[PDB]
Amino acid sequence: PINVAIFGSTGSIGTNALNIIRECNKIENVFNVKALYVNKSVNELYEQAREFLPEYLCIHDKSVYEELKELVKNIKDYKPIILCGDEGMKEICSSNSIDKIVIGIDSFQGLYSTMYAIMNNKIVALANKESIVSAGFFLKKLLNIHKNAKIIPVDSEHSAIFQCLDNNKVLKTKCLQDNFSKINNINKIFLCSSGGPFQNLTMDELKNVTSENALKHPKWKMGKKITIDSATMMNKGLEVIETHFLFDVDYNDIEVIVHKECIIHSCVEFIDKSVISQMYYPDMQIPILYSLTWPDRIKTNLKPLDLAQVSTLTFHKPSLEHFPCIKLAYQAGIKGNFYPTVLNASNEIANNLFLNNKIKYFDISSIISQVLESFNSQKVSENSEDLMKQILQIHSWAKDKATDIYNKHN
Amino acid sequence: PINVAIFGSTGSIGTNALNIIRECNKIENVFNVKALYVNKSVNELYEQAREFLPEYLCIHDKSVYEELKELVKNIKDYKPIILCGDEGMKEICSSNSIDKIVIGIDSFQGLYSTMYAIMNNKIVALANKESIVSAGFFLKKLLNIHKNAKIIPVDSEHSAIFQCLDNNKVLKTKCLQDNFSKINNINKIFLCSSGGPFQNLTMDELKNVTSENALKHPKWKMGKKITIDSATMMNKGLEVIETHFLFDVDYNDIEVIVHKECIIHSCVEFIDKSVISQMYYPDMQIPILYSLTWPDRIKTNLKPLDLAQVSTLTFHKPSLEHFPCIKLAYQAGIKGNFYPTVLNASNEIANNLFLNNKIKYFDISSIISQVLESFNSQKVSENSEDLMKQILQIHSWAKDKATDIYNKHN
Ligand SMILES: CN(O)C(=O)C[C@@H](CCCc1ccccc1)CP(=O)(O)O
Ligand SMILES: CN(O)C(=O)C[C@@H](CCCc1ccccc1)CP(=O)(O)O
Ligand SMILES: [Mn+2]
Numbered sequence: 098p099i100n101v102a103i104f105g106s107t108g109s110i111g112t113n114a115l116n117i118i119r120e121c122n123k124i125e126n127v128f129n130v131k132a133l134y135v136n137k138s139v140n141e142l143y144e145q146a147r148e149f150l151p152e153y154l155c156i157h158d159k160s161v162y163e164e165l166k167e168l169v170k171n172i173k174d175y176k177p178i179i180l181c182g183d184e185g186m187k188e189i190c191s192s193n194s195i196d197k198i199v200i201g202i203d204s205f206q207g208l209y210s211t212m213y214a215i216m217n218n219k220i221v222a223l224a225n226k227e228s229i230v231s232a233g234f235f236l237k238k239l240l241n242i243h244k245n246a247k248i249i250p251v252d253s254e255h256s257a258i259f260q261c262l263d264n265n266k267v268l269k270t271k272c273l274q275d276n277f278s279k280i281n282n283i284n285k286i287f288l289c290s291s292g293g294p295f296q297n298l299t300m301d302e303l304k305n306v307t308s309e310n311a312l313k314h315p316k317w318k319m320g321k322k323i324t325i326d327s328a329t330m331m332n333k334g335l336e337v338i339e340t341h342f343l344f345d346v347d348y349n350d351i352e353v354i355v356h357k358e359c360i361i362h363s364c365v366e367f368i369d370k371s372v373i374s375q376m377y378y379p380d381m382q383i384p385i386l387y388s389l390t391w392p393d394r395i396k397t398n399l400k401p402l403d404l405a406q407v408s409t410l411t412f413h414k415p416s417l418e419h420f421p422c423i424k425l426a427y428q429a430g431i432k433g434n435f436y437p438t439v440l441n442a443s444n445e446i447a448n449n450l451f452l453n454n455k456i457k458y459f460d461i462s463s464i465i466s467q468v469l470e471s472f473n474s475q476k477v478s479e480n481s482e483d484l485m486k487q488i489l490q491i492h493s494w495a496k497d498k499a500t501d502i503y504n505k506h507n
Numbered sequence: 508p509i510n511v512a513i514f515g516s517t518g519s520i521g522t523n524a525l526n527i528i529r530e531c532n533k534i535e536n537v538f539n540v541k542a543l544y545v546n547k548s549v550n551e552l553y554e555q556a557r558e559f560l561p562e563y564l565c566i567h568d569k570s571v572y573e574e575l576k577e578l579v580k581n582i583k584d585y586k587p588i589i590l591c592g593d594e595g596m597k598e599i600c601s602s603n604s605i606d607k608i609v610i611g612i613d614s615f616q617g618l619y620s621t622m623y624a625i626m627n628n629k630i631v632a633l634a635n636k637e638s639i640v641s642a643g644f645f646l647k648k649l650l651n652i653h654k655n656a657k658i659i660p661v662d663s664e665h666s667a668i669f670q671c672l673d674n675n676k677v678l679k680t681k682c683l684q685d686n687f688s689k690i691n692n693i694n695k696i697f698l699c700s701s702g703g704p705f706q707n708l709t710m711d712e713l714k715n716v717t718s719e720n721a722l723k724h725p726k727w728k729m730g731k732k733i734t735i736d737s738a739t740m741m742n743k744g745l746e747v748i749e750t751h752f753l754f755d756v757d758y759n760d761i762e763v764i765v766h767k768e769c770i771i772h773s774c775v776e777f778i779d780k781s782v783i784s785q786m787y788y789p790d791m792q793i794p795i796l797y798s799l800t801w802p803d804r805i806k807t808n809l810k811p812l813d814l815a816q817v818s819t820l821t822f823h824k825p826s827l828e829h830f831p832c833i834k835l836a837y838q839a840g841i842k843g844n845f846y847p848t849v850l851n852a853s854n855e856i857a858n859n860l861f862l863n864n865k866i867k868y869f870d871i872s873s874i875i876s877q878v879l880e881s882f883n884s885q886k887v888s889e890n891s892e893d894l895m896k897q898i899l900q901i902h903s904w905a906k907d908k909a910t911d912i913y914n915k916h917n
């Protein structure tokens with residue numbers, strides 16, 4: 098049985114994870130859900146506990162902790178360990194009965210739980226791209242210390258890339274390791290993008306797009322922050338840096354391609370120039386499931402891909418003039434050092450300002466650019482603890498610098 | 508170093524093989540061409556010998572044997588073992604200095620050299636699909652006896668399929684072994700076809716097509732027999748049976764899909780419904796190379812796929828009414844026993860009759876259908892030598908029946 102913990106079990110990733118676990122378990126008993134962790138959704142967590150009966154429950158918000166304890170008394174033949182806060186999280190990661198941890202939490206807590214999962218040598222199914230972009234150096238160092246820990250990518254394009262690799266090679270290395278691409282014979286990556294809602298818009302039209310334009314009638318329905326990043330293509334920019342760190346692919350060997358059908362999820366060109374790609378309907382259940390079944394696959398009842406019905410797949414180059422956030426991401430990744438930390442942090446601020454109708458489309462890239470221009474490279478700390486503090490300091494500085502730029506112009 | 512023999516070195520597969528070997532060896536010394544085998548092209552063989560300096564030369568036509576000996580005296584610092592005929596071929600197959608053998612010969616001599624390669628426990632890069640269709644039972648039986656022999660597919664779609672599989676699983680089985688698909692978690696195959704030159708003709712237009720039409724302006728340039736089979740889609744029919752036998756995939760799980768761009772070479776759906784595909788420009792060098800590098804890949808200087816330039820990929824269902832040979836192939840495969848041997852043999856005759864303007868397009872499938880209707884299933888010989896004789900008898904009978912049917916209606 099695959100023993101799995103879900104962190105952020107009521108968010109999008111966590112709920113998709115439990116859905117595919119439920120459906121697969123109907124076919125064959127394959128997963129044991131050992132732990133669920135949520136912030137504050139005490140009722141939703143009780144409902145999940147009633148179904149999956151995990152050994153561990155944890156809620157972050159101490160003010161709903163007691164409520165959770167009595168709710169759970171309602172469940173027949175069930176006596177879970179019920180914990181709360183950061184230290185419940187740590188206790189779950191240290192448990193010897195847990196093998197794989199799905200990280201469906203953003204920002205701080207996401208990276209923090211990831212760190213604890215790695216320290217305990219677990220398999221970590223990681224969807225949070227911002228943590229790889231911002232703290233890649235730290236994750237790489239930590240993965241080198243904890244030799245049995247592994248990050249398995251859940252971001253759909255990175256899952257696709259991973260699924261295009263020969264496991265006889267993968268098993269000789271692991272993600273985020275130097276030489277990953279050499280060992281796997283990788284030459285180049287095609288990183289597929291939906292292109293978002295604005296591919297056909299002129300520069301003058303882009304000047305006036307609004308957050309409602311970006312959010313309304315969403316092709317793929319997802320959270321607000323990522324929807325805005327899809328609209329600017331900063332999502333793909335982040336995902337370029339994510340690719341580089343996960344797979345040790347040089348930036349000149351990563352090509353963003355706009356594939357509006359979202360059937361081909363990304364492709365890998367090997368050193369003989371043969372190309373392998375992964376394909377399915379847009380659906381996060383496949384990337385999540387693979388992260389938990391790797392290096393194997395199990396049966397599902399998902400809708401089979403009907404290629405004849407799909408009929409046409411298309412591909413075109415993104416215009417860097419229209420989507421300047423892509424160029425900024427490449428520039429930051431190529432400059433290296435903590436420029437990716439800076440890019441991510443400034444985008445966090447700029448994205449949210451645009452979301453809330455405070456700045457315009459090209460102001461997003463303008464602010465990010467100015468913050469990047471304001472950063473001086475720093476010597477990279479050798480010490481793991483010092484390195485994490487350096488990342489946090491830089492993240493905080495960059496957010497502040499973005500906000501200060503806004504406030505001046507405002 | 509990879510020690511390779513090429514059987515049929517002056518044909519299309521053989522010359523693509525030597526071209527990719529030459530180019531790859533410029534990058535890094537990887538291949539030793541140990542043996543070359545041709546029918547009668549003494550001058551061309553001498554030129555390949557001058558370049559590749561193989562330890563073995565073999566010519567099937569005894570009447571050019573002496574000529575070859577003299578020619579070779581022209582080569583400085585070179586003293587090859589120079590051989591001839593079927594027995595020269597057996598001698599090459601049994602050499603301990605040869606590891607991999609490319610089978611780029613058709614018909615009898617293709618099957619015969621394949622058998623000897625297997626008997627000598629070699630890796631056999633097999634491009635001759637007809638031998639798998641006609642003699643599948645015998646190849647399976649032989650591979651079960653010779654445990655270290657392996658067939659690696661070179662037919663482009665079958666190479667694609669093979670390239671979409673995880674070698675961590677492939678290495679626990681082998682082509683033509685029962686349970687191959689189970690071990691590799693295969694659910695279903697998308698078998699891509701160019702559709703050939705007649706794909707958009709109406710039924711009235713099809714009645715009238717000629718072999719000149721099928722051979723003229725050929726999308727992909729290749730031999731006449733396969734070009735005719737591409738026109739009727741019997742090529743893909745044969746390739747469905749090839750798929751079944753190489754990969755132990757049920758016929759109901761093989762879908763022919765027309766992909767006119769010939770960039771995606773075929774796709775594999777796994778039991779979770781994730782799909783993996785292999786992609787490159789139409790170029791036999793990739794499938795040939797992979798057959799010789801598997802389970803590894805090596806660097807080439809081939810042109811990199813430009814997906815944005817390619818721009819559009821399309822997929823549609825073939826019409827069984829317009830391409831009845833497809834239906835016949837499925838029916839024959841599904842009925843099993845030696846119906847595939849009959850299908851292959853009767854097609855050999857019907858293809859050639861049409862090529863030479865003796866019958867019309869729909870007569871091809873008519874003759875095939877009638878021969879299949881005649882055939883009575885036979886008890887499958889347990890004995891390997893007996894089984895081969897049985898296949899050869901059925902092949903010979905089926906050709907004569909096709910010819911007889913032609914002669915009556917003539
Ligand atoms: C899903 N995913 O990993 C995303 O990054 C969102 C992406 C893809 C949305 C379509 C999709 C949804 C689920 C699974 C796969 C693809 C939007 P874009 O490419 O424009 O940046
Ligand atoms: C190349 N190959 O394996 C063929 O069977 C010929 C095939 C594909 C021709 C295009 C092609 C050439 C070289 C390599 C890959 C694809 C024609 P069809 O699909 O109409 O039956
Ligand atoms: Mn993504």
Ligand SMILES: [Mn+2]
Nearest residue numbers: 662663664746
């Ligand atoms: Mn083929």
